[PDB]
């Protein structure tokens, strides 16, 4: 939709809304991020709460206690058990809600500057004018980031987030030009220029922009980030006309960019909140069940299923009973009318819901919330996966998906700043066909052969950096740097013709480049540089370092202390870099030997290698082709280590074929040909005979832990698929040192040219990958892939590759066959695409981690989504269900805790079900003495305790702190994942036969107790009786919370004393209980049950066998997979035993560089 | 700083022992289970073996049995002596009409002579069973007023309208005089009339004394407490209409405190098979001899096919007469060497070693 803001300007005669006259009600600038606005928090979350299907039973068994049909005693005070948990549950995610809240209270709170001159967006409840006065209080106050609204002039000041999405008017850079750190929108470790709109270039202060009137005619928010129309509109001064300026996506300041190296840029403010391109490649934070969460609803269904047999059994069992003649009832009882019953054992099925009841368990949901939620909490609480330097710990956002990380199986990692570390060190360069640079980045691939006895040549390089610091020791005026420089080469020596080529290399280093020089107001003798490219930055500061100072610039050209003394240097002409271009060249003027002659010049070309050495000089004598070989075979050893290429060229030109060409370059300079290509032409030209002095090199720095982090993610199963939003050899150096990408591995690019073309070598990989389509036979397959290809895809050509439903499934199986998959210049849309794509067609956990807003879509569209902490407020950390510091703490977060919180509640929950069922069955079983009328075996303090007091606790410790393995040796052994990737430890079968043990140990924990009454029924020593119903129905009772507690005790690894003193006072409490209320008179019929009871030794005789007989079917299984066929976890941990791990320290960290030697 | 707390807790490092089934901890922990539970299904089977029970059912008294000493039809009578085990010496039943009694669907004395060729012990417990009788079913076992139980004067709307335990269908008569005790457990009282003694048959002045004292628990004078009615606001339940005819007077009013029979009937029986002590001697021992019960008749059970007997034993500390404590301690005591014999064989004939057979590394 086509919106015009309008500025300073009355709207026009669309206003005819009045109580606010602005029609088209753009959103308050307020980032949301939060699972639940407070208007419908409390019905969206019962309605999640109530798409659990035993919450839907409860609410039926409550509505069904209404009616007298079924008699129940206080049927009002049945619904207190679902209330308190539904509210304890909304608390819960209400606080987990709003933690969310006071992250978006922060950034809605983050104080932009914006003009006090009167908005008429607003709701209720020659461009600039000097013939107007300059009135007062017109200053750009500091108001709130919330505040922003659309039409709003907002002086963005150096260094600070953008708040929404404005079109620039002006910077203080003369000619309006701007830079932006887009590494929250895109992956782009550069600077864009942004221009501001040449109509209002000159607007300068807050009085020259109350004055200035115009309006935006612009189109809608569009959710692309690399394109917008606008049209600027405004009326011309003295004259009736109205003039038009274009405005596009160069002219755009997006929410996620930084103002960067510029001191302020106004622009006026076009979309706001969910408008900006930000939130629209966002959603509202979804819900995100857990998938063990998703598939207790089939294990819920299961338990109505046998809750529907029983009653059926016991609706057609009693109702068959009415219909009998010689019955005691027609005597005792009063229900002397013979008749009146045909078939009604209808109200007997109906008792019999009410009576078994609690074979679908109240405390289910609120067990594995207090689950879910402690397991957010022990994340939150360790300190492993706490970032000292940004003072912050892991912090779970999504407090019950933690057993999702744990069956994760697919991780779509973004690239720049999720990878990197946003630090570019000049590490490496050639000079002469000489390599100089001594870096220890990648020399870790080798953890096949050598050892990791390689602390040394850290220390060796560290010394040799130290070395080097007191050679180039000379008093250099502005190279402050013995703690920036990040170039230890030792060879910075005089062994020459090599000398000369390497004072002349640096100087080509501090001649061609962008960089500016501003005075830092710390130490203003020491100035830093101010690069559009942070490789400049890193090209530049280490020729400041081994002497080549650039340290300020002149309108003749730029000034170079070489080596202590500075030298004027004189630009005759910059050839900018480009996209197109990939290379940038500097003239620079050579000075005069012979007096009276006017001197001669130098070219120098720095760019891409393989287009620089296609632009070099064959027709020569010297040895300009006898080192072509030695930088060529550097600058592949150089990409294979990870590290951005470059080249330095040069042409020392004579002054007049120079000045030929200098002529023909203001040919098309001073004519409007800009927009034609004949200036690059011209700037062909001169860029053909080279003479190459070298390449140089640079680490895209990743983050601490990085290489050793997915080696781990690798061993561990899980698939990295890298989808950035930069380009694609960038993204290839990134793989490199990451040990992504692996020399030997065949790179399977895309690479649409110009629509076919895509699914023909989508089959051709598909003949070296021997398969055509089949998907269906791929799922079944969760290995980590052999064959070495890596794919690499331009997301223009995934935008095809993702666009009908046979291409997709082509594109994916070659992307699940390749071991490196990268998506390189993908869009936030794309990104998430790519997680749906595999999310949905193949049925796999899929994880996302990302810092920054192009990740955003990709994180919430993920079964987790990870945000990297940074020092500023990050969208991918606010709307993410964890967020770490570091991408090394993923290693701690889904081996340890994850695959922790996988197999505890993989656990948990058939040992819950199996805990209820073998008390629940009981009043199945008592049916059959009962003639299934619907008496209940149990006192109604043991139906309300059994699960709330006497076995509650055993399982939430076991689904809270049990442990396969430590802490150490999930990360020793990560292979230790694959039972979560293959799905072995949640199956509806693993549920089945828990299922199939809770019948058969109820079957003991009635019938033993009845083999002992059913004979005589007399129990007791002294003979006195023991045969009321409740008294049997200790005896069950007691077998059912002592085999509940030492079965759920018996199935946990990691017997601590936290969760053995609360199994032990559980098994405890049901003793405890029944002898303090069966010592009272409100007893009733219980009242010496536990005199009686207790003291009776055949209900200890009855304790010992059948405890026994409920645990030993089970006990017996274990037994005999635990000695023939075990999984892999009992086995590590009979290594654990035999302490194969004793030689790690405690909390043993892997991808930690600070780690101490095992 | 933000940093959160280390203390072995919250960083989950609490001290633990991670258990690991070796077969050299759990193979000795199966032999060690079944060598107790042999041992104690062997020792709950032998004292079980001496548990000495007569049982003998009396439904049939008033038809198969004469007025001549008749044996009992083999049928009715169960005798368990462990000294004796070929023991057939038939019981004896008579059965003398009482045409006064004017009820005739359970009327007269069924007169009973046994022969325990056995001394029981100290503890000489006269049960009576009630097969087929359903104490069990829903509205049965609620049906009484604890208000009146704990001896309150308690109103017709706590007896009837008391919300889980009500006396509902028999909570006041047609004249509004509520019964007391009310609801249908109390109701259905077992009747008949077991003597205090056992006639010692050709033996004069040793007849073996019982008594109804030491019934119930004594702790059950807590809850069963002396009634507050006045005789003028109660009724007796309606078939307790023949034991009081005119109602309550002044002085009949039953004490429920002392009166332990109704203290056993009102603990409703778990099961289909219902064992109520209504006799008990704790002072002698009786010897072996013949032995005589002269039960009052009241109770009918025919009209609904059950059985009512007699169940005369000393139980052990286990109670009763019982094999299957014994039995099955005997079972899973086999069971778990069955398989402490099954899963060492397959450790020596498959058995791998505890180190390396890990899906990894292959
Ligand atoms: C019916 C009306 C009832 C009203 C309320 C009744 C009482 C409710 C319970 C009492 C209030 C409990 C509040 C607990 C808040 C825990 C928040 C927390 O741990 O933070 C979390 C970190 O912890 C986690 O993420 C782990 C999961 C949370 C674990 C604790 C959850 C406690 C609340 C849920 C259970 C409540 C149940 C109550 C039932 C009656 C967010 O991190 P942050 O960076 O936002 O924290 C910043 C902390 N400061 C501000 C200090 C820098
Ligand atoms: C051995 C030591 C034991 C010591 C005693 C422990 C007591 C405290 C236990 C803490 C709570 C742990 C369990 C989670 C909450 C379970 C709540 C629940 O569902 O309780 C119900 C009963 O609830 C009630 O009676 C009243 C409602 C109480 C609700 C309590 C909620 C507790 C929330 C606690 C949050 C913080 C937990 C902290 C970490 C453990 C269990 O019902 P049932 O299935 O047993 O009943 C069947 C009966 N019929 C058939 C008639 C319906
Ligand atoms: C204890 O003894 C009484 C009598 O010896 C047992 O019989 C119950 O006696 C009452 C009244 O004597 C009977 O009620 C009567 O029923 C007839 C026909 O059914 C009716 O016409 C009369 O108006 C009167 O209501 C009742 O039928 C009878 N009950 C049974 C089950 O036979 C009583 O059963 C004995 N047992 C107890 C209290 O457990
Ligand atoms: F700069 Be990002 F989206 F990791
Ligand atoms: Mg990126």
Redesign the interface.
């Known amino acids: 939709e086509l919106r015009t803001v309008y500025y300073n300007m009355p709207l026009p005669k669309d206003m005819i809304d009045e109580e606010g006259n602005p029609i088209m009600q753009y959103p308050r600038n307020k980032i949301r991020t939060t699972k639940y606005t407070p208007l419908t928090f409390l019905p969206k979350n019962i309605l999640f709460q109530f798409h659990n299907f035993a919450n839907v039973y409860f609410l039926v068994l409550i509505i069904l206690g209404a009616f007298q049909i079924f008699?129940v005693?206080?049927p009002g005070l049945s619904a207190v058990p679902l209330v308190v948990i539904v509210i304890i549950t909304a608390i819960k995610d209400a606080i987990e809600d709003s933690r969310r809240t006071v992250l978006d209270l922060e950034v809605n709170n983050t104080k932009t500057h914006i003009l006090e001159g009167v908005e008429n967006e607003n709701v209720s409840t020659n461009i600039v004018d000097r013939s107007l006065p300059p009135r007062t209080d017109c200053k750009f106050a500091k108001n709130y980031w919330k505040g922003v609204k659309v039409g709003d002039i907002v002086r963005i000041h150096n260094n600070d987030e953008i708040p929404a999405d404005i079109i620039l008017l002006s910077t203080s850079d003369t000619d309006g030009a701007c830079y932006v750190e887009t590494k929250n929108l895109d992956g782009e470790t550069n600077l864009k220029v942004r221009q501001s709109l040449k109509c209002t270039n000159t607007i300068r202060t807050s009085k020259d922009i109350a004055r200035t009137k115009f309006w935006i005619e612009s189109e809608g928010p569009h959710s692309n980030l690399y394109t917008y129309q606008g049209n600027m509109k405004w009326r011309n001064l003295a004259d009736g006309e109205i003039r038009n300026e274009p405005i596009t996506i160069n002219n755009v300041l997006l929410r996620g960019c930084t103002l960067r190296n510029t001191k302020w840029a106004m622009g006026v403010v076009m979309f706001t909140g969910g408008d900006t391109k930000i939130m629209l490649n966002s959603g509202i934070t979804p819900t995100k069940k857990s998938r063990i969460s998703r598939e207790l609803n089939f294990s819920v269904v299961i338990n109505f299923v046998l809750l529907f047999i029983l009653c059926f059994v016991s609706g057609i069992a009693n109702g068959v009973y009415y219909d009998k003649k010689?019955?005691?009832?027609?005597?005792?009882?009063?229900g002397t009318i013979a008749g009146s019953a045909a078939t009604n054992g209808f109200v007997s099925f109906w008792?019999a819901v009410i009576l078994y009841q609690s074979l679908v368990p109240i405390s289910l949901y609120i067990s594995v919330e207090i689950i879910k939620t402690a397991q957010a909490a022990?994340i939150?609480?360790?300190?492993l996966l706490?970032n000292?330097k940004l003072?912050?710990?892991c912090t779970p956002k999504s407090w019950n998906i933690s057993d999702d990380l744990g069956q994760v199986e697919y991780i779509f990692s973004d690239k720049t700043g999720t990878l990197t570390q946003n630090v570019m060190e000049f590490k490496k360069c050639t000079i002469n066909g000489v390599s100089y640079g001594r870096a220890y980045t990648e020399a870790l691939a080798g953890l096949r052969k050598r050892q990791g006895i390689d602390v040394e040549t850290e220390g060796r390089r560290e010394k040799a950096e130290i070395a080097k610091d007191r050679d180039t020791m000379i008093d250099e005026l502005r190279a402050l740097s013995g703690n920036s420089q990040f170039y230890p080469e030792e060879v910075t020596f005089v062994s020459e013709v090599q000398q000369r080529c390497c004072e002349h290399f640096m100087l080509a280093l501090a001649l061609c480049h962008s960089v500016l020089v501003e005075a830092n107001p710390d130490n203003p003798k020491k100035l830093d540089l101010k690069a559009q490219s942070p490789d400049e930055a890193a090209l530049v500061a280490t020729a400041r370092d081994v002497g080549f100072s650039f340290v300020g610039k002149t309108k003749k050209g730029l000034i170079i202390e070489m080596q202590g003394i500075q030298k004027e240097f004189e630009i005759l002409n910059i050839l900018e870099f480009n996209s197109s271009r990939k290379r940038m060249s500097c003239i620079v003027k050579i000075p005069g030997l012979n007096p009276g002659d006017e001197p001669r010049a130098l070219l120098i070309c720095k760019g891409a290698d393989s287009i620089i050495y296609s632009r070099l000089s064959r027709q020569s004598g010297s040895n300009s082709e006898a080192i072509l070989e030695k930088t060529a075979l550097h600058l592949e050893q150089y990409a294979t280590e990870g590290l951005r290429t470059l080249c330095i060229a040069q042409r020392e030109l004579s002054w007049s074929e120079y000045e030929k060409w200098n002529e023909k370059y203001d040919i098309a300079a001073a004519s409007l040909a800009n927009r034609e290509d004949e200036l690059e032409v011209v700037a062909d030209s001169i860029e053909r005979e080279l003479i190459l002095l070298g390449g140089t090199a640079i680490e895209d720095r990743l983050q601490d832990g990085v290489p050793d982090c997915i080696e781990l993610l690798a061993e561990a199963g899980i698939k990295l698929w890298v989808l950035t939003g930069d380009k694609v050899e960038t993204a290839i150096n990134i793989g490199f040192s990451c040990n992504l990408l692996n020399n030997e591995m065949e790179l399977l690019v895309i690479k649409t040219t110009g629509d076919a073309l895509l699914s023909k070598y989508l089959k051709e990989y598909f003949n070296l990958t021997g398969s055509e389509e089949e998907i269906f036979e791929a799922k079944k397959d969760h290995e980590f892939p052999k064959g070495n290809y890596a794919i690499v895809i331009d997301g223009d050509a995934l935008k095809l590759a993702l666009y009908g439903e046979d291409i997709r499934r082509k594109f994916l199986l070659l992307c699940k066959n390749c071991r490196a998959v990268l998506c390189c210049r993908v869009s936030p849309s794309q990104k998430a695409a790519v997680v749906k794509l595999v999310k949905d067609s193949l049925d796999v956990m899929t994880l996302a981690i990302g810092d920054g807003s192009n990740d955003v879509a990709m994180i919430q569209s993920a079964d987790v989504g990870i945000g990297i902490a940074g020092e500023e407020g990050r969208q991918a950390v606010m709307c993410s269900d964890y967020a770490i510091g570091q991408f090394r703490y993923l290693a701690r977060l889904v081996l340890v805790h994850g695959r922790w919180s996988y197999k505890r509640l993989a656990e948990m929950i058939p040992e819950f079900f199996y805990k209820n069922m073998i008390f629940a069955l009981a009043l199945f079983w008592?049916g059959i003495?009962?003639?299934f009328?619907?008496?209940?075996?149990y006192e109604?303090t043991y139906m309300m305790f059994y699960n709330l007091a006497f076995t509650s606790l055993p399982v939430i410790f076991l689904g809270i702190?049990d442990?396969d393995?430590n802490?150490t040796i999930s990360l020793v052994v990560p292979?230790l994942y694959?039972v979560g990737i293959l799905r072995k430890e949640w199956n509806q079968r693993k549920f089945l036969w828990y299922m199939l043990d809770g019948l058969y140990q109820s079957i003991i924990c009635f019938f033993?107790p009845?083999?002992?009454?059913?004979?005589?029924?007399?129990?007791?020593?002294?003979?006195?009786?023991?045969?009321?119903?409740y008294?049997?129905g200790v005896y069950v009772t007691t077998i059912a919370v002592i085999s509940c507690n030492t079965y759920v005790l018996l199935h946990q690894?990691?017997?601590?004393?936290?969760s053995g003193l609360f199994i032990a006072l559980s098994c405890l409490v049901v003793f405890a209980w029944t002898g303090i209320w069966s010592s009272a008179?409100a007893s009733?019929?219980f009242?010496?049950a536990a005199?009686?009871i207790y003291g009776?030794?055949?209900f200890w005789?009855?304790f010992?066998?059948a405890v026994?007989?409920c645990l030993?079917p089970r006990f017996?299984y274990?037994?005999?997979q635990?000695?023939?066929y075990?999984t892999?976890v009992?086995?590590?941990?009979?290594?654990?035993?035999?302490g194969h791990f004793d030689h790690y320290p405690?909390?043993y960290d892997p991808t930690d560089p600070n780690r101490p030697k095992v | 700083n933000r940093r959160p707390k280390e203390d072995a807790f919250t960083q989950q490092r609490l001290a633990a022992i991670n258990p690991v089934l070796t077969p050299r901890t759990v193979l000795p922990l199966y032999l060690l289970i079944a060598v107790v539970f042999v041992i104690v299904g062997g020792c709950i089977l032998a004292q079980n073996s001496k548990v000495d029970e007569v049982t003998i059912y009396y439904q049939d008294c008033m038809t198969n049995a004469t007025s001549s000493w008749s044996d009992i039809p083999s049928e009715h009578w169960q005798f368990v002596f462990h000294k004796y085990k070929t023991y057939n010496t038939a019981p004896q039943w008579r059965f003398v009409d009482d045409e006064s009694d004017d009820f005739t669907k359970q009327r007269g004395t069924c007169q009973i002579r046994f022969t325990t060729p056995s001394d029981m012990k100290n503890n000489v417990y006269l049960n009576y069973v009630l097969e087929k009788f359903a104490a069990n079913h829903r509205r049965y076992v609620l049906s009484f007023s604890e208000d009146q139980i704990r001896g309150e004067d308690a109103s017709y709307e706590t007896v009837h309208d008391a919300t889980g335990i009500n006396c509902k269908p028999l909570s006041k008569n047609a004249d509004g005089k509520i019964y007391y005790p009310c609801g249908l457990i109390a109701n259905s009282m077992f009747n008949d009339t077991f003597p205090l003694q056992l006639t010692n048959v050709g033996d004069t002045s040793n007849n073996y004394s019982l008594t109804n004292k030491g019934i119930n628990w004594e702790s059950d004078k807590k809850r069963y407490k002396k009634t507050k009615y006045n005789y003028t606001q109660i009724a007796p339940p309606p078939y307790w209409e023949k034991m009081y005819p005119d109602g309550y007077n002044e002085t009949n009013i039953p004490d429920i405190q002392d009166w332990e029979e109704f203290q056993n009937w009102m603990r409703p029986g778990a099961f289909d098979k219902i064992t109520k002590l209504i006799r008990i001697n704790k002072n002698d021992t009786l010897p072996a001899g013949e032995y005589q019960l002269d039960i009052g008749l009241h109770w009918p059970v025919l009209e609904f096919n059950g059985k009512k007997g007699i169940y005369l034993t000393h139980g052990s500390h286990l109670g009763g007469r019982n094999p299957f404590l014994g039995i099955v301690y005997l079972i899973g005591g086999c069971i778990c060497a069955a398989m402490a014999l099954i899963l060492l064989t397959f450790w020596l004939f498959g058995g791998r070693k505890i180190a390396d057979a890990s899906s990894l590394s292959w």
């Open positions: 008699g005693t206080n010689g019955r005691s009832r027609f005597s005792y009882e009063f008792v022990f939150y609480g360790d300190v706490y000292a003072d912050y710990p008592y003495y009962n003639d009328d619907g008496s209940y075996l109604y702190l442990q393995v802490d292979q694959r033993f009845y083999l002992v009454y059913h004979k005589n029924m007399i129990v007791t020593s002294n003979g006195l009786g023991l045969d009321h119903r008294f049997v690894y990691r017997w601590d004393w936290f008179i009733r019929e009242f010496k005199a009686r009776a030794p055949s005789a009855v010992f066998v026994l007989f030993l017996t274990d037994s005999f635990k000695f023939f075990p892999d009992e086995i590590v941990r009979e290594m654990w035993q035999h405690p909390g």
